[PDB]
Amino acid sequence: SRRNIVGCRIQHGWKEGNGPVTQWKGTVLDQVPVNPSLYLIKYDGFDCVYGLELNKDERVSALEVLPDRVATSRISDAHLADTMIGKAVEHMFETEDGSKDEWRGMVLARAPVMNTWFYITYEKDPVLYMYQLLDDYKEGDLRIMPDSLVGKQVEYAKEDGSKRTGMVIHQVEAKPSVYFIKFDDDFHIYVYDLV
Ligand SMILES: O=C(c1ccc(C(=O)N2CCC(CCN3CCCC3)CC2)c(Nc2ccc(OCN3CCCC3)cc2)c1)N1CCC(CCN2CCCC2)CC1
Ligand SMILES: [Cl-]
Ligand SMILES: [Mg+2]
């Protein structure tokens, strides 16, 4: 059947609604243990982690595994990285307009495959991002703040109106009360604290 694409680069076509087919490239970060059809992907030029069933999803076409080898790395400062994971943070960034904005978030883990990158989520957007946080730290754009469910089906009641259903796919080791959630008809990875 299919080979193991974790750690590999890919390209594929994508068809949204009745729009045309667009072409994408990305790096496959992980294959979800509790749903091996789901892959976590970082598409080039964007810093969120997206969940796609690359082989089932009929909006995917012309899936091709690239031959690129992602340049590996050993990181710039392990202790800073270690002590940063699991911590609340303030992340400062330049908008499209050029002005500066600052978001509150939480550093989740070291990203797979891409060693100098970190899983992080935010209060204003509780999904899974990834950034080279050690550099934003040294640039002064990041500040640290003072301090079993996997596989289960779940639904999030969001008024007004309807709800979303999905699956819990990952437990964050650094904060075991936090989980990744894949919802149906949405390709972001949601990050919630399930008390
Ligand atoms: O719609 C976008 C889009 C457009 C612009 C930006 C951006 O540059 N952006 C500029 C940089 C970024 C800033 C966020 N950071 C900056 C530092 C801290 C926070 C925001 C958007 C962006 N990036 C981005 C993403 C997701 C996110 O999470 C969703 N949030 C956004 C706000 C509300 C919901 C945030 C940003 C995404 N795409 C592009 C990727 C694509 C992958 C899924 N397909 C499906 C199959 C093949 C590929 C889906 C469609
Ligand atoms: Cl904020
Ligand atoms: Mg603030």
Side-chain angles (χ1 to χ4, degrees):
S1 274
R2 19 266 204 164
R3 32 170 167 164
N4 179 29
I5 60 178
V6 170
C8 304
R9 311 245 316 139
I10 65 174
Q11 59 187 340
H12 65 83
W14 182 258
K15 186 188 180 63
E16 290 200 347
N18 282 333
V21 178
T22 55
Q23 187 71 17
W24 300 83
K25 291 185 175 168
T27 298
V28 174
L29 306 166
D30 200 3
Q31 181 175 17
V32 169
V34 302
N35 176 357
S37 307
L38 185 63
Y39 300 95
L40 306 193
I41 311 170
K42 177 189 156 57
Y43 288 95
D44 294 358
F46 307 96
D47 299 315
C48 290
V49 177
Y50 297 94
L52 276 193
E53 288 176 3
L54 281 170
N55 300 308
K56 300 175 174 171
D57 195 326
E58 290 191 340
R59 301 170 295 177
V60 175
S61 73
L63 175 58
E64 180 155 16
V65 179
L66 292 173
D68 317 0
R69 284 198 56 253
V70 166
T72 334
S73 7
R74 289 199 284 185
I75 91 127
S76 341
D77 183 11
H79 168 262
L80 172 57
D82 261 39
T83 50
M84 205 193 325
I85 289 171
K87 305 282 182 188
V89 297
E90 290 276 14
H91 193 184
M92 177 108 76
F93 60 97
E94 287 180 16
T95 182
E96 302 177 334
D97 170 53
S99 47
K100 291 175 77 193
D101 200 338
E102 171 172 77
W103 286 12
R104 205 110 158 251
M106 172 169 61
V107 180
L108 299 177
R110 181 101 66 169
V113 179
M114 310 183 35
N115 266 338
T116 65
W117 292 68
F118 290 73
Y119 284 167
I120 187 182
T121 187
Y122 299 101
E123 283 201 20
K124 278 180 190 159
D125 194 0
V127 306
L128 181 61
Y129 290 71
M130 61 187 291
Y131 288 105
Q132 303 184 97
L133 288 189
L134 303 158
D135 294 298
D136 302 340
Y137 188 90
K138 299 170 191 178
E139 298 177 302
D141 291 325
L142 178 78
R143 314 190 315 252
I144 307 201
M145 294 295 104
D147 209 330
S148 296
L149 272 174
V150 186
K152 276 74 187 58
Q153 296 290 307
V154 57
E155 58 183 41
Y156 180 78
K158 189 60 180 179
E159 50 222 20
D160 271 26
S162 296
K163 53 178 181 168
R164 312 144 110 177
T165 53
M167 181 172 61
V168 180
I169 61 164
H170 181 80
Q171 180 184 265
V172 174
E173 280 194 2
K175 283 209 60 163
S177 70
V178 186
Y179 294 87
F180 297 168
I181 293 161
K182 178 68 172 61
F183 291 114
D184 304 318
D185 310 331
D186 197 320
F187 42 50
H188 294 99
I189 303 311
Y190 286 77
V191 189
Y192 291 115
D193 192 333
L194 289 187
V195 303

